[PDB]
Amino acid sequence: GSHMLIFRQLFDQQSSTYTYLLADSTTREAVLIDPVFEQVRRDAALIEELGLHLLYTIDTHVHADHVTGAWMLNRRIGSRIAISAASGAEGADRYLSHGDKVEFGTRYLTVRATPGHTDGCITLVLDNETMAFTGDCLLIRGTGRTDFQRGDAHTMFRAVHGQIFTLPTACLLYPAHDYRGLTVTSVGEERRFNPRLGGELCEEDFTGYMTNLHLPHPKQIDVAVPANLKCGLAEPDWAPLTCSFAGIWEINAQWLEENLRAVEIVDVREPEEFNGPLGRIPAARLISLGELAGRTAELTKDRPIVTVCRAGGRSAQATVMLRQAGFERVANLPGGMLRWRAEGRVVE
């Protein structure tokens, strides 16, 4: 291998936004394109599980449909914020212009200016031109809308034809949104089959199409745009907690051993295990997983609960059951009793 592309496309159901994680497989340096504020914990957890270092978030434009996660990721894991200079956004670390390279390891994206949806849209072209991220400029068999944010259908047509359709025909095109379950298109497909501006359609054909869309008023533009013009400027605190990519809150085991009386330890193993050679954590209370749902009245509402099992799996499902029963301070012991014993930690 060596310096291969690690690639992840992630979808945000609320806004139908695609976020793209890219990284160099050797150096593990990464960029994240169009992160969504509501998905910041998810994105961060994925970056951690893949063992990546996020150098930059990159916004293709000022979004009207969601708040960018750029600000919050900068705060949380120190990624730098990049957006186009033409966007007018304040508070970025790097302002991008046509021709700029965003580097990650030996890999890079090159910026092409592709306004039309907004005046600050850009398209990010992978170094080898096998894929490009088109924002809301070119969508799968469509385009972004042109009626807000200083959009302009004449400008969009010229950007698509002049900057995107000039890429190689096999180049994949990853958009910032899709509402139909589609993930990718290609230069050759859109050149031929885009129904608004592909085939032989001219600029006036396209602008007549766009004038007669009459889309509903953008439902979030009055909140999202002022937030994104500041790059996205507007957690459980009872212990050092981390959320897995799977969505499970996990407690720090060293902290737990030093603070055993601050929490209720719920052991969801079977009785033969609870009394078995793995031992148990001092004051662990046995409630086997198959009984837990029906016995939550026995758990206190005054201290956090940490669930434990053999190796962390059953106790993860116990956190789900406890959250569904309304317990809001619950965490899993990652690695379970096996890891607890492997680290020589105290047992009854």
- Binding site, by residue number, is 61, 117, 136, 145, 179, 196, 219
- The site map against Fe ion for 208-227 (x = CB under 5 A) is --------------------
Query: Which segment (128-136, 150-158, 194-202, 244-252) binds Fe ion by CB under 5 A?
Result: 128-136
- The site map against Fe ion for 29-58 (x = CB under 5 A) is ------------------------------
Quote the least distance from Cβ 64 to Fe ion, whole Å: 5
CA distance 74 to 44: 11
Quote the least distance from Cβ 336 to Fe ion, whole Å: 45
Q: Which among 56, 49, 111, 112 has a CA at the least distance from the CA of 79?
A: 56
CA distance 276 to 267: 13
Using the minimum distance from each CB to Fe ion, give the nearer residue, 34 or 267: 34
Structure tokens of 182? 């589609």
- The site map against Fe ion for 76-115 (x = CB under 5 A) is ----------------------------------------
CA distance 218 to 68: 16
Quote the least distance from Cβ 61 to Fe ion, whole Å: 6
For 53-62, b where at least 16 C-beta lie within 10 A, e where not — what string? bbbbbbbbbb
Using the minimum distance from each CB to Fe ion, give the nearer residue, 225 or 284: 225
Chain residues 130-149 in contact with Fe ion, contact rule CB under 5 A = 136
Angle between helices 70-77 and 40-49 (to 10 degrees): 50
- Binding-site residues for glutathione: 145, 179, 196, 219
Kindly give, in sequence order, each residue whose CB lies less than 8 Å from that of residue 89, ignoring residues fewer than 6 positions away: 59, 62, 83, 120, 228, 229, 230, 231
Quote the least distance from Cβ 76 to Fe ion, whole Å: 24
Quote the least distance from Cβ 87 to Fe ion, whole Å: 11
Using the minimum distance from each CB to Fe ion, give the nearer residue, 138 or 251: 138
CA distance 89 to 62: 7
Q: Report if residue 119 touches Fe ion, rule: CB under 5 A.
A: no
Asked if 274 and 267 touch (Cβ cutoff 8 Å), the reply is yes
Asked if 300 and 275 touch (Cβ cutoff 8 Å), the reply is no
- Binding-site residues for Fe(3+): 61, 117, 136
Asked if 82 and 97 touch (Cβ cutoff 8 Å), the reply is no
Using the minimum distance from each CB to Fe ion, give the nearer residue, 29 or 136: 136
Binding site for Fe ion (CB under 5 A): 136
